[PDB]
Amino acid sequence: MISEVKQDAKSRMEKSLSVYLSDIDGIRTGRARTSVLNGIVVETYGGRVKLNTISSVSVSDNKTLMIKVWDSNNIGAIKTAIMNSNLGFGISCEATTIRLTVPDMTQDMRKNLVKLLGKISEDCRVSIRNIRRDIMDRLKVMQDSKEISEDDLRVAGVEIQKITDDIMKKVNDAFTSKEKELLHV
Amino acid sequence: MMISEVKQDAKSRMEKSLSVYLSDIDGIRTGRARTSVLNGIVVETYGGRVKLNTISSVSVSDNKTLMIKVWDSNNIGAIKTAIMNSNLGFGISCEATTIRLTVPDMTQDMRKNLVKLLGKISEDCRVSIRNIRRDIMDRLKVMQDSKEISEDDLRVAGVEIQKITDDIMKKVNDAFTSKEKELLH
Ligand SMILES: [Cl-]
Ligand SMILES: [Cl-]
Ligand SMILES: [Cl-]
Ligand SMILES: [Cl-]
16 A cells, blocks of 8 residues: 555654754753753652643743742752753752753854754754655565556655655754754854 | 663664564565465454454465465455455455465566565665664764763763664664575575
């Protein structure tokens, strides 16, 4: 069934783009962003919880986040979890608010991240092209196995080459957007 | 952001590539009778949907022939429909409570093509695995340049992830040569 093969393309491609966005989303840029704390796991209330379910995070200025802790008994555990992530924030507190200052990014650190983000952008393109090559290889198998005609191969090839190109534009826009965050002040 | 999580990402993503390639080559006809070809067959009967192997028992009769013992002979039509709809290319005949499937004969030119395509599909899998390793290594390098982990930390993680890659590469290659042996008899 070609119908089942055309969905493996979009599924594998979307899943791959989804993996690469999550990977770059955490790359630090100098500017303070609440998502850097997305995935801080705090041990409280008998288990492990995401930081945003027991507090409220906000950007105070370019280099600072505020964390409003609703249960004051969670302040130490949150301070401990943030410190032990080794993200290296400046940590202090007043009453039920934790203040995080974002460490400065040096010039060399910023150039290394520009290069490493380019490499990851190409690792993404490679998986998208490799998915495409593999899907065509599968259709060539079906067409050689006399399961589909040649017309079925060219037609689905055009449709999938169109799906690949649209998915790739998302890849280039996402990695260009992240690069602009690195480059600007 | 923890090295342990990055390592688990490598494993999970390379096991997804391995699993996807195994299913790709499972769709390659070999000219020989193999019961695994009918594993996914879903049969509409008794007003619902059942796996083929809960209403029947598939055996290999000779090199080019499968025998399906249909316990409820009233299911023979529904099973024949299910198999023919999956477009697997079988010759089919009925007899009492039995369905004879003849494997479609494979020319030497088809076999030559499928060997070549198996090698391409296999190398696509290797490209995916190596790309994942490079991507994971780039993510570790981002963490090191961002001062979240040391250079020794990264090298230690790099060896462990080389171990994961070697182990999944070996399973890709063993599936490759085993599938080649089947294509060549
Ligand atoms: Cl600081
Ligand atoms: Cl650096
Ligand atoms: Cl894949
Ligand atoms: Cl590197």
